[PDB]
Ligand binder design. Structure first.
Ligand code: CL
Ligand code: CL
Ligand code: CL
Ligand code: CL
Ligand code: CL
Ligand code: CL
Ligand code: CL
Ligand code: CL
Ligand code: CL
Ligand code: CL
Ligand code: CL
Ligand code: CL
Ligand code: CL
Ligand code: CL
Ligand code: CL
Ligand code: CL
Ligand code: CL
Ligand code: CL
Ligand code: CL
Ligand code: CL
Ligand code: CL
Ligand code: CL
Ligand code: CL
Ligand code: CL
Ligand code: CL
Ligand code: CL
Ligand code: CL
Ligand code: CL
Ligand code: CL
Ligand code: CL
Ligand code: CL
Ligand code: CL
Ligand code: CL
Ligand code: CL
Ligand code: CL
Ligand code: CL
Ligand code: CL
Ligand code: CL
Ligand code: CL
Ligand code: CL
Ligand code: CL
Ligand code: CL
Ligand code: CL
Ligand code: CL
Ligand code: CL
Ligand code: CL
Ligand code: CL
Ligand code: CL
Ligand code: CL
Ligand code: CL
Ligand code: CL
Ligand code: CL
Ligand code: CL
Ligand code: CL
Ligand code: CL
Ligand code: CL
Ligand code: CL
Ligand code: CL
Ligand code: CL
Ligand code: CL
Ligand code: CL
Ligand code: CL
Ligand code: CL
Ligand code: CL
Ligand code: CL
Ligand code: CL
Ligand code: FE2
Ligand code: FE2
Ligand code: FE2
Ligand code: FE2
Ligand code: FE2
Ligand code: FE2
Ligand code: FE2
Ligand code: FE2
Ligand code: FE2
Ligand code: FE2
Ligand code: FE2
Ligand code: FE2
Ligand code: FE2
Ligand code: FE2
Ligand code: FE2
Ligand code: FE2
Ligand code: FE2
Ligand code: FE2
Ligand code: FE2
Ligand code: FE2
Ligand code: FE2
Ligand code: FE2
Ligand code: FE2
Ligand code: FE2
Ligand code: FE2
Ligand code: FE2
Ligand code: FE2
Ligand code: FE2
Ligand code: MG
Ligand code: MG
Ligand code: MG
Ligand code: MG
Ligand code: MG
Ligand code: MG
Ligand code: MG
Ligand code: MG
Ligand code: MG
Ligand code: MG
Ligand code: MG
Ligand code: MG
Ligand code: MG
Ligand code: MG
Ligand code: MG
Ligand code: MG
Ligand code: MG
Ligand code: MG
Ligand code: MG
Ligand code: MG
Ligand code: MG
Ligand code: MG
Ligand code: MG
Ligand code: MG
Ligand code: MG
Ligand code: MG
Ligand code: MG
Ligand code: MG
Ligand code: MG
Ligand code: MG
Ligand code: MG
Ligand code: MG
Ligand code: MG
Ligand code: MG
Ligand code: MG
Ligand code: MG
Lengths: 173, 173, 173, 173, 173, 173
C-alpha cells in the first residue's frame, strides 16, 4: 500500500521475519518427528516422547508470535514449504538431544542475524521483540539441552542399557 | 524387522497412512495461513481468525493420531515436506470458507481411498480407526463449512459491506 | 546541582523527555475531546465515547510514567501548555479513528526519535524504558486503530446509516 | 441547530461552562505538577505527592462533569489550551498548600460568577448543578487546605527541619 | 572446550561478568556491615538495620543471577576474594545512606561499562539481561537512597537528636 | 568505652568471635561456589546444586548469629576479606562432598577452640551460645556429609557413570 499501520519497518526486516517463521515451523516439525520416534515399539521412551512433543508445541508458538508481529507491523506473511527433518530414525535419546542442541544453536544464529539487521535498520521495536521473546528462551533451551547431553554422555548412553531408561524416568519424568 | 508388534498390517496401508499424515499437516498449514490472513490490519475479522486457528489445531491432532496409529501397528513414520498453501492472500471470508470446504472434500476423498485400501487388505482395525476418528469428523466439517458458505453468499459477501463483519460477530463469535 | 542521583543522563535526553511528556498529555486531550464528541445528542455512539475516554486515561498514564522517569533520573520536569485538539467536531466515528491513527503514528515517530537520541547518548536505561513501556504499546495501538478503520471503511462508514451504529455495538461493546 | 434537546439554555451560559471546563483542567494540571514536585529526589514527601495526585484526578472529574452537562443541555464543548502552571518549582510543602488554597478560591469565584449568570438567565437546572456538585466541594477543599496551611505554619514549615516530614507522615499518611 | 552451549559469548564479556559478580558480592557485604552497625547498643536504629539487611540479601541475589548467566552462556565462574567494607563504624544513619548511594552509583557505572562492552561485542542477550534485571533496579535504588539522604539532611541528621530516630520509625518502619 | 552493656566479655573472646564470623562467611562462599559448579552445562547435577546452595545460606545464618552475639555482648564487629574458595572446579559430586566434610571439620575445630577460650575466660554465656547453636549443628553436618561420601564411594563415584546421577535424584531429591 503501504499498509496504513506500517511505520519504520524495512522490507528487509519483513522478509527476514518471513524466513524466521519458516525456521521456527521447521524446528517444530523436527521436534514432532523426534516425539514419535520415542514412542516406537523398539524405542519406547515415553518421557523423551513427551519432552520433544512439548518442544514441538513451543516452536509452533514461536512461529505464531512472529506471524502476529508481521501483521502488527503491517508486513505480509509469506509462507514457504516446511522441509521434512534430516533424519527419519533419530538413533537414540542421546543422538536426538545432540541434534536438538545443534538445531537450537542454528535457530539462535538466525535470531542473532535478525537482531543485527533490525539494529542496522534502526528498528528498536523489532530488537526489543527478539530480546523479550526469543533470545533468552534460546539461551535457556540451549543450556537445558546441553545439561541433558552431558548427563546422557556421563551415564553411558546410548550403549549402556540402563542409561536412557533411567534418564527418561528420573529427569524427563 | 518386521516389528515384533506388526500383525495384519500391509506395507501399502503403512505407506498410505504416511501420505495421510502429510495431507493432515498440509490442511493444518492451510488453516494457519487463513487464521493470520484474518488478523491483517486490512481484514481484521478476529472471529474468522479464531475459527481457522482452531481448525488448524484440530488438523495437527488428526496428523498426530495417524502418527500414533503407525507406531501402534509397527509401521515406520516417514515424514515429507509440508507444502505451503496455494494462496498467500485469501481474498475474503467467503473465499476462505469456500477454499476450506474444497480442502475438506479433498481430504475426505483421500480418507475414503484409504478406507477402500484397508478393506481390500482385510484390515478391520484400520477400517474402524478411520470410521471412528476421521469419516464422521470430515462429514461434520464439510457440513459446517457448507452452512457457513451458504450464509455468507445469501448475506451478500464479499462485496456487501456488512456481511462478513456481521457473520464474524454473530456466527463465529 | 547536579542532582545527587543523576548519572549518565544527558541534558538533551532530559529536554526530549519533557517534550514527550507534553505530547502524551496532548494525546490524552485529543482522546478526551473525541470521547465527549461521541456523547453529543446528535452523535450518541456511547461505545465510541467509552473507547476514546479509556484511550485518554491511558495517555495520561503514559505522561505520568515519563514524569516519574524524569524524577528517577534526577532531571527536572518542565511542563508546557497542553494545546487544544485540532478539531472541535470530529465529524464521524471513522474520521475520529483515522485522526487517532495519525496521532498514534506521530507520537510513535517522536518515541523513535527519543530512542535514537538515547542510543546516541549511550543511555541504555532510557532505551530499555522506551522499549518496555512505549514502543510495543504504540505498535499495538496503531494496529488496533488500523483494524477499526478498515472495518468502518468496509462497512460503508460514515454515510451507510447502520455502519457506525453496528460497529459501536459489536466491536466497541 | 439549535440541538433538538436544547431548552432554556442561554448562549452565555454555554460559553461560561466552556470557560469553567478549561479552568478545572488547569486546576488538574497545577495539582499534577505539584504531585511530581514532591517526588523529586531533593523533596521526597511521598504523601504530599499522593495528596496532590488525588486532587489532580478530582479536578479532571470536575472538568468531565461540566463536559457532560454541556452535552446534556445541547451546548457544544469548545476546548482551549490548558495553560502550564505558574511555577515549575513549588519551593515547599507549605508553599504548595498556600498556592492550592489560592487556586481553589479563584476557581470558587469563577463558580460563583457562573451561578450568578445562571440565576440571571433563569436557569435553575444549571444553578442546582453547580450547588449539588461544585459549591460545597469547593468550600470543603478550601477548608481542608486552610487546615493544612495552619498546621504547617504552626509546626514551623518550611524551615523547621521536622515540620513537613512529620506532616507528610501523620496528616497526609 | 569451548562449552557445547557457548555461542556469541566473547571471553571479555565472560571476564567482565566475573568482575561484576565480585562487585555485587562486595555490595552485599557493605550492606551486611551497615545492618549490624545499626543494631549496636550505642546506635540501636532497628529499621535502619532491617533496611540494610534487606539490601544485603538483594545484592546476593544480584550476584547469583550473574553466576547463573555465566553458566547459561557456557562461561566459567571465577570467584575472587570479597573485600571487606571501607568502614567498620558507619558513623550515622545519614552517613550510611550517603555511602550506600555512592556504592550504588559506582556499581551502576560498572553495569553501564558492562553494557557498553556487550554492545561492542554484538551480544544482545547480555545487553537485554542487564537492561531487564540490573539497570532499572539500579536507577530505583539510587533514587530511593537519594530520597532518604534528602529527608535525613533536611531533618537535621546526624546531630539533631530526633532526626534519625524519627526517620527510622516513620520511613523505614 | 567500654560499651554500657559489656559484662564478663574478654577482649580475646571478642577477637575470636570476629575470626569465627569470617570463617562462617568463608564456608558460605565455598558452598556458593560448589552450588554453581553443579549447575554447569557439563556437570548438571541440579540437586547437588540445591543442596550446596542451602548449605551456603545456612552458613550465612551462622555468621549473622555471631554478629548478633558480638552486638548483644557489647563487642565491636570487625569484618575482614572473605577469601575465595580453594578450587574453581570442584571435579565431581564426590570430591565436593569430601571437601565440604573437611571444611566442616576445620570449622568445628575452630568452634572447639573458641569454646575452650570461653571456658578459660569464665564466660558461660558464650559457652552455652556455642553449645546451643553451633556444636550439635556441626556434628550433624559432619555426619550427613560422611553419610553422603560413603554412599557415593560405594556406588562407584566419580567414574561409575550412573553413581552421581542416581545419588542426585534419590538422596538429594
Ligand atoms: Cl515503513
Ligand atoms: Cl523461508
Ligand atoms: Cl522451499
Ligand atoms: Cl532442497
Ligand atoms: Cl537476517
Ligand atoms: Cl545486534
Ligand atoms: Cl535501533
Ligand atoms: Cl526471551
Ligand atoms: Cl539434565
Ligand atoms: Cl559431557
Ligand atoms: Cl548401564
Ligand atoms: Cl503384517
Ligand atoms: Cl507424502
Ligand atoms: Cl514433497
Ligand atoms: Cl511441486
Ligand atoms: Cl490409499
Ligand atoms: Cl471402503
Ligand atoms: Cl476387513
Ligand atoms: Cl469420526
Ligand atoms: Cl452457518
Ligand atoms: Cl448458497
Ligand atoms: Cl450490507
Ligand atoms: Cl549525568
Ligand atoms: Cl513541550
Ligand atoms: Cl506552548
Ligand atoms: Cl501555536
Ligand atoms: Cl528526541
Ligand atoms: Cl534507535
Ligand atoms: Cl547504549
Ligand atoms: Cl511497550
Ligand atoms: Cl476492528
Ligand atoms: Cl481498508
Ligand atoms: Cl447500512
Ligand atoms: Cl435554549
Ligand atoms: Cl477557556
Ligand atoms: Cl488559550
Ligand atoms: Cl498568555
Ligand atoms: Cl460567568
Ligand atoms: Cl447567585
Ligand atoms: Cl432560576
Ligand atoms: Cl458540592
Ligand atoms: Cl490539617
Ligand atoms: Cl495560621
Ligand atoms: Cl523541627
Ligand atoms: Cl562463543
Ligand atoms: Cl574480581
Ligand atoms: Cl582480590
Ligand atoms: Cl588491595
Ligand atoms: Cl566492562
Ligand atoms: Cl551501551
Ligand atoms: Cl548487539
Ligand atoms: Cl532492572
Ligand atoms: Cl525518603
Ligand atoms: Cl538535600
Ligand atoms: Cl531534633
Ligand atoms: Cl567485660
Ligand atoms: Cl578474620
Ligand atoms: Cl584477610
Ligand atoms: Cl593470603
Ligand atoms: Cl579461639
Ligand atoms: Cl571446652
Ligand atoms: Cl564458665
Ligand atoms: Cl547446635
Ligand atoms: Cl547419604
Ligand atoms: Cl566409605
Ligand atoms: Cl554405573
Ligand atoms: Fe522448551
Ligand atoms: Fe513450555
Ligand atoms: Fe524457536
Ligand atoms: Fe527452539
Ligand atoms: Fe529411581
Ligand atoms: Fe473443526
Ligand atoms: Fe474443536
Ligand atoms: Fe483432518
Ligand atoms: Fe479437516
Ligand atoms: Fe489503548
Ligand atoms: Fe487499558
Ligand atoms: Fe501515549
Ligand atoms: Fe497513544
Ligand atoms: Fe538495545
Ligand atoms: Fe479533594
Ligand atoms: Fe477523592
Ligand atoms: Fe474543581
Ligand atoms: Fe478544586
Ligand atoms: Fe509518629
Ligand atoms: Fe533494594
Ligand atoms: Fe526487596
Ligand atoms: Fe546490585
Ligand atoms: Fe545495589
Ligand atoms: Fe528489553
Ligand atoms: Fe545443613
Ligand atoms: Fe536448613
Ligand atoms: Fe557454620
Ligand atoms: Fe558448616
Ligand atoms: Mg514490499
Ligand atoms: Mg530458512
Ligand atoms: Mg507417549
Ligand atoms: Mg527435500
Ligand atoms: Mg540406536
Ligand atoms: Mg526477559
Ligand atoms: Mg516395508
Ligand atoms: Mg499427499
Ligand atoms: Mg485474534
Ligand atoms: Mg512449491
Ligand atoms: Mg477481497
Ligand atoms: Mg462415531
Ligand atoms: Mg541543565
Ligand atoms: Mg511537542
Ligand atoms: Mg457514555
Ligand atoms: Mg492555538
Ligand atoms: Mg459527519
Ligand atoms: Mg514488552
Ligand atoms: Mg451559539
Ligand atoms: Mg479561563
Ligand atoms: Mg509516590
Ligand atoms: Mg504561557
Ligand atoms: Mg524550599
Ligand atoms: Mg450537597
Ligand atoms: Mg577463555
Ligand atoms: Mg572489582
Ligand atoms: Mg534488628
Ligand atoms: Mg584489604
Ligand atoms: Mg556519629
Ligand atoms: Mg524492566
Ligand atoms: Mg578492645
Ligand atoms: Mg580465619
Ligand atoms: Mg538449579
Ligand atoms: Mg588469595
Ligand atoms: Mg570430574
Ligand atoms: Mg541443642
Amino acid at each position: 500500500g503501504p499498509s496504513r499501520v506500517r511505520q519504520n519497518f524495512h522490507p528487509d526486516s519483513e522478509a527476514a521475519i518471513n524466513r524466521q517463521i519458516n525456521l521456527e515451523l521447521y524446528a517444530s516439525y523436527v521436534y514432532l518427528s523426534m516425539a514419535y520416534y520415542f514412542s516406537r515399539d523398539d524405542v519406547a521412551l515415553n518421557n523423551f516422547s513427551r519432552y520433544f512433543l512439548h518442544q514441538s508445541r513451543e516452536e509452533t508458538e514461536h512461529a505464531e508470535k512472529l506471524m502476529r508481529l508481521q501483521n502488527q507491523r503491517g508486513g505480509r506473511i509469506r509462507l514457504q514449504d516446511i522441509k521434512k527433518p534430516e533424519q527419519d530414525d533419530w538413533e537414540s535419546g542421546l543422538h536426538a538431544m545432540e541434534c536438538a542442541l545443534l538445531l537450537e544453536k542454528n535457530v539462535n544464529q538466525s535470531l542473532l542475524e535478525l537482531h543485527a539487521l533490525a539494529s542496522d535498520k534502526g528498528d528498536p521495536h523489532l530488537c526489543d521483540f527478539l530480546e523479550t521473546y526469543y533470545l533468552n528462551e534460546q539461551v535457556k533451551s540451549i543450556k537445558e539441552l546441553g545439561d541433558h547431553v552431558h548427563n546422557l554422555v556421563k551415564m553411558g548412553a546410548p550403549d549402556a542399557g540402563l542409561a536412557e531408561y533411567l534418564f527418561d524416568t528420573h529427569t524427563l519424568g
